[PDB]
Amino acid sequence: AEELEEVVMGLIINSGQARSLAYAALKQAKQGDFAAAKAMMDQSRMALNEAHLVQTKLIEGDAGEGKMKVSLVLVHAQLHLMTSMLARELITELIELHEKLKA
Amino acid sequence: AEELEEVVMGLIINSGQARSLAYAALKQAKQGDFAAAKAMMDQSRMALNEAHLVQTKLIEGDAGEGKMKVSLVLVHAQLHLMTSMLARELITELIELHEKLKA
Amino acid sequence: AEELEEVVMGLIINSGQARSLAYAALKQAKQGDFAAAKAMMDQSRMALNEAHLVQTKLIEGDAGEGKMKVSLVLVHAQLHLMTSMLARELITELIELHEKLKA
């Protein structure tokens, strides 16, 4: 719907940007730039945190009537956010491995 | 609905616990504890397997009328389970890498 | 529905095959076969690309009436595709690490 629909687009874009930043963070690690990787990861998380917070309000205050479940719309947003958050967390682990290797 | 709704909560919690155990398993690997990591991974999988089995019954025996597809509710459960299973599988790979590194 | 339902099954199978190929690609890397890993990854991506293209047509040309959003059915397909694509991308990163790790 109006906002919910426009809000989802923002969430999808935000989630996509989060992943983009995360992959970029990893790329920095490959170049041996741990400092930039850490900075990129930190920002990536903040983007996700804000996105997750918005989704939480939706999931909690969404359902007009009773039930708390979710909606077709929310599920789509959750899919992007869940994927992005997971990607970012795993990417963080991958970056840590690069540090252990040396570079 | 009654059970389905309560069942989903259990699945979501179970999926979340699965991931939690998986991340913890990885943490053990970082401490150089391959034995504990393996034990944690094994338990993580068992939790997922039981969760997946419940979802399968849902997906197969859910749809009251004809169609086998899924439902708004099932999709949400699948999202958590799919994310958790994938996370756990990737985490397993990450742990194996730690073993190859040494520690 | 008829096609959409049958199309989803194809997408789910394709997504599953994509992941299967990706994991197999990783396995090749463990055996120290970077050439086979690369070949498997390339094919995995092509499978996903074709799958993603089909989903795009669905998401863009699906909704019979106005709205572009998604449908219960599409979300399910997106879940598998999103999971598979992410898995494959992360697996690619994991394979690159194996190459850096010698073998």
Swiss-Prot record, chains A, B, C:
Transmembrane segments: none annotated. Its cofactor is Mg(2+). Pfam families: PTS_IIA. Can also use copper and nickel with lower efficiency. It comes from the Bacteria. GO terms for cellular component: cytoplasm. The active site is at H76. InterPro entries: PTS_IIA_lac/cel (IPR003188), PTS_IIA_lac/cel_sf (IPR036542). GO terms for biological process: phosphoenolpyruvate-dependent sugar phosphotransferase system. Residues 2-100 form the PTS EIIA type-3 domain. Induction: By GlcNAc2, GlcNAc3 and beta-N,N'-diacetylchitobiose (Me-TCB). The modification Phosphohistidine is found at H76. Keywords: Cytoplasm, Phosphoprotein, Phosphotransferase system, Sugar transport, Transferase, Transport. GO terms for molecular function: transferase activity. It is found in: Cytoplasm. Forms a complex with ChbB (EIIB). ChbA is a homotrimer. The PTS EIIA type-3 domain is phosphorylated by phospho-HPr on a histidyl residue. Then, it transfers the phosphoryl group to the PTS EIIB type-3 domain. The phosphoenolpyruvate-dependent sugar phosphotransferase system (sugar PTS), a major carbohydrate active transport system, catalyzes the phosphorylation of incoming sugar substrates concomitantly with their translocation across the cell membrane. The enzyme II ChbABC PTS system is involved in the transport of the chitin disaccharide N,N'-diacetylchitobiose (GlcNAc2). This is PTS system N,N'-diacetylchitobiose-specific EIIA component. It comes from Escherichia coli O157:H7. The gene is chbA.
